[PDB]
Amino acid sequence: AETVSFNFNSFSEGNPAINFQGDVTVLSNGNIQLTNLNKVNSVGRVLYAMPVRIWSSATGNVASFLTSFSFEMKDIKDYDPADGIIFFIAPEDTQIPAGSIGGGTLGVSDTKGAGHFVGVEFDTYSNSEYNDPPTDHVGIDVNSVDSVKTVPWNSVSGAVVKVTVIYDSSTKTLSVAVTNDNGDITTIAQVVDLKAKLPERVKFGFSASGSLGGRQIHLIRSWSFTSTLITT
């Protein structure tokens, strides 16, 4: 029974358990601000420093995980509300894409919108080049910001959002429950073979980005994660 679990009610630069990549910054209130408001094509990501072992090559087993987190997205004059926040899983050596153009890549992909990761995006800008739905949406991404499945959603400025994810190794199901501040939930599920799509050792985290004309405040308030791998 191999398990990894942690709980951040607040963050702080200096905390060895966190990996800061790009324009990431930490506010005097413990919140993490992923993007820089004055940087074109801004990209900021935060990662759990310790690489998690999601599956065993020996046992063929795959872990299951439960994780919750809340974020916030507030607008700013006079930019467009973009681009979004994505919770992703990736190889332990994951770094912000080379020459990342930010924007609809969410900091996890290249220009064509491709990359090595599995995530749940909170897209606030419709990028047709990635086949984005017409309105804001929550999506399951598999090596591409061109979601495998999306669900109509609405990002409310200044609103605090709570999300809960559950990956069941057996059914290979990734279910997501989004709680808007109006008390309404939005759910989206999709089967994803992590052992097929990702390497044994991965890292979890968040990524947010902006463009020259589209920018907004992306904040990661709290995060709790628990994964268990049936070993021997």
Q: Under rule CB under 8 A, which residues in 148-167 are in contact with its own copies?
A: 149, 151, 157-158, 160, 164, 166-167
**166 and 175 Cβ atoms separated by less than 8 Å:** yes
Regarding 139 and contact with Mn ion (CB under 5 A), the answer is: yes
Q: What phi and psi, each to the nearest 5 degrees, are found at residue 183?
A: 80, -10
Binding string, residues 102-141; x marks residues near its own copies by CB under 8 A: ----------------------------------------
**186 and 178 Cβ atoms separated by less than 8 Å:** yes
Encoded tokens for 64: 């299951």
Regarding 29 and contact with its own copies (CB under 8 A), the answer is: yes
Q: How many residues bind its own copies (CB under 8 A)?
A: 72
Three-state SS at 176: strand
CA nearest 7: which of 94, 66, 85? 66
Q: Which residues from 94-133 bind Ca ion, rule CB under 5 A?
A: 104, 123, 125, 127, 132
In the list its own copies, Mn ion, Ca ion, none, the entry touching 125 (Cβ below 5 to 8 angstroms by class) is Ca ion
Encoded tokens for 209: 């980005």
**Residue 132, annotated as binding a ligand:** yes
Three-state SS at 152: strand
**Residue 36, annotated as binding a ligand:** no
**Residue 218, annotated as binding a ligand:** no
Using CA of residue 156, residue 173, residue 230, residue 201, what is the dihedral sign? negative
Chosen residue from 65, 130, 204, 223 binding its own copies by CB under 8 A: 65
**Binding site residues, Ca ion, CB under 5 A:** 104, 123, 125, 127, 132
**Binding site residues, Mn ion, CB under 5 A:** 123, 132, 139, 147
